[PDB]
């Protein structure tokens, strides 16, 4: 997919502000790999915002 590999910033919801990198992209909910903690989270793709 085109999104996978990008560095995205969660722009809405409880995780707002965390920087991460997409492991897997879906038609709906991408999986962002959090740089701050050790964990991977599923977020709606409307929340994500690509950084650079």
């Amino acid at each position: 997919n085109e999104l996978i590999g990008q560095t995205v910033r969660i722009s809405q919801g409880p995780y707002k502000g965390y920087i991460g990198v997409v492991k897997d992209a879906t038609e709906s909910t991408a999986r962002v790999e959090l740089h701050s903690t050790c964990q991977t989270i599923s977020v709606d793709r409307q929340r994500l915002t690509t950084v650079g």
Binding site: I4, G20, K23, H35, T40
Partner: protein, 427 residues
Amino acid sequence: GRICRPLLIVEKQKLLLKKRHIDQLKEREYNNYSWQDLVASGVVEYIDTLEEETVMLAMTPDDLQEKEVAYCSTYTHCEIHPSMILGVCASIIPFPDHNQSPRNTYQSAMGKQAMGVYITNFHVRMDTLAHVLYYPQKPLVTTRSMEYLRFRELPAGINSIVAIASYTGYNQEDSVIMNRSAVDRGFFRSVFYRSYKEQESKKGFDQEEVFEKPTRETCQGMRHAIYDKLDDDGLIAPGVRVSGDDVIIGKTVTLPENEDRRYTKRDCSTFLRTSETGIVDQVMVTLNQEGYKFCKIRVRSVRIPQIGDKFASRHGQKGTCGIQYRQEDMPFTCEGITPDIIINPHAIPSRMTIGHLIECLQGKVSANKGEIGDATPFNDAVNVQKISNLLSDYGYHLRGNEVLYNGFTGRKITSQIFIGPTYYQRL
């Protein structure tokens, strides 16, 4: 190969270690008066095990050269200090004569496993499985012998306000309740480094490893993972988050039947170890013994204390974390002091680590008095009654009990919870 130990020398019923030796020996680096000058002075000497069968050995001079109903009055040597019968791991135990001896053995096992700053140059070292700690502390309750193992310089563990209380029931069967707010303030938050080495192998042209970023269209057998984390030389630049089955070293080995079509060199890459994650700390690139290029990657992952994490006292009192409550849920004294750990009261009476209780009491005395307290084993100048009389002056109960209030209901707990600081080790 014989095994000896130094002992003092006792002429008729008097030590030869006179006051002038202590006067010349306090002023070292000035008089250049060493241990070896005291061996040369005919005061101490090394006695081995055969010769211990033919020696009459005073334990301590304050008891065993004074006239009484006389035991032998024919002493030849005197022991220097009885605490020097112990090893290096049994020397870090406070009051180890008050414990039971299987508990001392079990702590001697656990003291080798405690996290801590294991060496001072750990940022240079590419060790595999480095466990270092954020804020290690020296023990408030220490021995004299920790000064010589340099345990106050590279310590392992944090002084914690334990309380010994039955509670919600998560410190049940050798487990402990921890404080979530304390842990959020850096309490036993450790950091685990793991290195990864890989070199390439110049061989007889049939298989030839080389570090490069492998491409899906060019390389074959390339596993489905992210390869854009790699740099242009097939390595990770430091400061990059990696997780389980992320690549860290892009390495491709050539295939001898690439002419014997269109599909060339196969992936031979080292992934990050699965079910682990963390930031790449630093990457070194060098040559090996053989002259081949050779990379090490040390990957950093901090380890916040969660439940299941195995903590231990200095007395063989291990136990995992049962639960973590926040500060408002944890009980509290008449002052604002909550516990950091709450250990089981049933961990004590069959195991018989009374030295844990005495370490806790001397810890209250030490943290109130403002001095690092002394816990050499065979002392006789510190018993529990003197500790209690020193604690009573700082406005506490004689025996360290203190009225905890409940953290949920606020009703003060009917029993009076023993509380105070011990020294816990994260394993």
